[PDB]
Symmetry: none
Subunit: 42 residues, 3 copies
């Protein structure tokens, strides 16, 4: 997903914890029932 | 909050795990950095 | 989680700023890498 990758992120299931919450970018262009979190997050 | 409550949810921090994920209704009208999950969630 | 909620808090990720530190109740029975902060610091 181009836009998630552009933000430095990857797609994960929407309930996956991404820390800090600022690195969780929301759905972006990930699929339905996934969200985009910045690499480094957890 | 009206809309979250109307869905039968409550507000929780943005990264709180809410399972099943269909019980997570996203931000709704919770505060910034919070999200609405159906009562009984995660 | 039960003890956190009992103490009037919510569980937030470990690096969430909770001030004043007296309203940061440490882990309580929040999940690994989360902590309990009193209503008002979040």
């Amino acid at each position: 997903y181009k836009q998630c990758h552009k933000k430095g992120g990857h797609c994960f299931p929407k309930e996956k914890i991404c820390l800090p919450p600022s690195s969780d970018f929301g759905k972006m262009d990930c699929r339905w029932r996934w969200k985009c979190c910045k690499k480094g997050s957890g």
